[PDB]
């Protein structure tokens, strides 16, 4: 198991994750925070080789990507009219997670 700096924060206090409406939608938060122009150079002139070496180090250290059993889904509700995932304004697009 992984360590914890703070006691686990769950909606039910055991395993149920905190989500909407108590927390903002993950896609809305990502669009609000991470949307911007590409091509901004690193202020420390760090290289891409360093970024992917760090990715290799992370793969060496931790791996929490593969799903567990039983299969639990925490789906990301795509807001209607999302430019990338809901271009047709369907309003029911859901990214499985």
């Amino acid at each position: 198991r992984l360590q914890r700096l703070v006691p686990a924060s769950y909606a039910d206090g055991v395993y149920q994750p905190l989500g909407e409406p108590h927390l903002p939608n993950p896609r809305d938060l990502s669009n609000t925070i991470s949307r911007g122009p590409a091509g901004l150079a690193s202020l420390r002139n760090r290289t891409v080789l360093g970024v992917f070496f760090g990715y290799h180090v992370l793969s060496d250290l931790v791996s929490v990507e593969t799903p567990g059993c039983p299969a639990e889904f925490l789906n990301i509700r795509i807001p209607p009219g999302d430019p990338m995932f809901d271009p047709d304004q369907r309003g029911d697009v859901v990214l499985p997670f």
């Binding site: 911007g36 122009p37 970024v51």
Partner: protein, 339 residues
């Protein structure tokens, strides 16, 4: 690119095995493999802790004082998100391929077009690529990554990560930042304020104190993020707070998390190469390992002149060999494959 790093380390292990076979012709397969693995692990630890970490966190681990048997080195749940986001904020839209003579070659796309760089979103889980067919192509990828400047350490993510990350289920594309936020919620990660409090950092009470430089400029990401959280700073999650804290460096929360995690990893490891009690290396061998950098590994496995790479391949400074032609952007690169 991650595959290129893996190939680099695989070739480094093979090269060390060949070196040890030359030094000890009588050694069997098992002994050669074990000695090569020991040396490669020591080199990997030295490069990751004393070269990559100081260059990418702007923080240096304290001087090694010995092995700590009673220190828990287990990876923390917060470290996963912190390291993942502090690295994903620097992923470029494309990657250059560089020749040994400071020549940036053209990249042949799967459309048969020629671009200036390898598009990241179109190379995910690539079984085969027209411009990646031999070992020399891997060497060119490594040199280009060494010469290319990464993205800015800020809240902005490229579309290759924000919109065209490999979708693990039912979708060829997904949002990596949204997936990371949903992972942090799944792992029960603490709030930004509680995470700061647990690490002894100064409490943040106003939204504009998260990143004073960010609020100084005309970027309204702080106000919009506060609006998304209904102005409740206590509900701000660890990942958005760490993303907003970054300015020229990972934010104090993420920097502290990664620094303490690596300190615990080094001190809590009995097989750390500097731990003289495990008998892995002698003092002279430990000095040799400390002197080894990633540039040495690249020179060794690529079989290239040392002057073709800067002494610290993690940071490119003026005067270093082969400057990048320009800071890469979405312009001029192949369009990401639709989901």
């Amino acid at each position: 690119f991650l595959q290129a790093l893996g190939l680099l380390w695989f070739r480094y292990h093979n090269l060390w095995a060949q070196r040890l076979a030359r030094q000890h012709p009588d050694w069997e397969d098992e002994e050669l493999f074990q000695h090569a693995r020991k040396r490669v692990i020591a080199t990997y630890q030295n490069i990751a802790v004393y070269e990559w970490l100081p260059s990418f966190l702007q923080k240096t681990l304290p001087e090694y004082t010995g092995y700590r048997p009673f220190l828990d080195p287990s990876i923390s749940s917060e470290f996963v998100a912190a390291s993942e986001q502090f690295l994903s904020t620097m992923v470029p839209p494309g990657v250059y391929m560089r020749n040994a003579s400071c020549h940036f070659q053209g990249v042949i796309n799967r459309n048969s077009s020629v671009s200036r760089a390898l598009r990241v979103c179109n190379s995910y889980w690539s079984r085969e690529h027209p411009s990646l067919q031999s070992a020399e192509d891997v060497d060119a990828l490594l040199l280009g990554m060494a010469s290319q400047i990464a993205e800015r350490e800020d809240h902005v993510l490229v579309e290759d990560v924000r919109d065209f990350w490999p979708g693990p289920l039912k979708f060829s594309r997904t949002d990596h930042l949204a997936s990371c936020l949903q992972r942090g919620r799944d792992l029960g990660l603490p709030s930004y304020t509680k995470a700061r409090a647990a690490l002894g950092l100064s409490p943040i009470t106003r939204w504009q104190d998260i990143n004073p430089a960010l609020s100084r400029s005309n970027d309204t990401v702080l106000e919009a993020t506060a609006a998304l959280y209904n102005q409740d700073l206590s509900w701000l999650e660890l990942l958005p707070g760490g993303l907003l804290e970054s300015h020229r460096d990972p934010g104090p929360l993420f920097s502290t998390i990664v620094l303490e995690q690596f300190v615990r990893l080094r001190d809590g490891d009995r097989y750390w190469f500097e731990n003289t009690r495990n008998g892995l290396f002698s003092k002279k061998e430990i000095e040799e390992i400390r002197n080894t950098t990633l540039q040495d590994v690249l020179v060794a496995v690529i079989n290239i002149d040392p002057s073709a790479l800067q002494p610290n391949v993690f940071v490119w400074h003026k005067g270093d060999p082969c400057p990048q032609p320009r800071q890469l952007s979405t312009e001029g690169l192949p369009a990401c494959a639709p989901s």
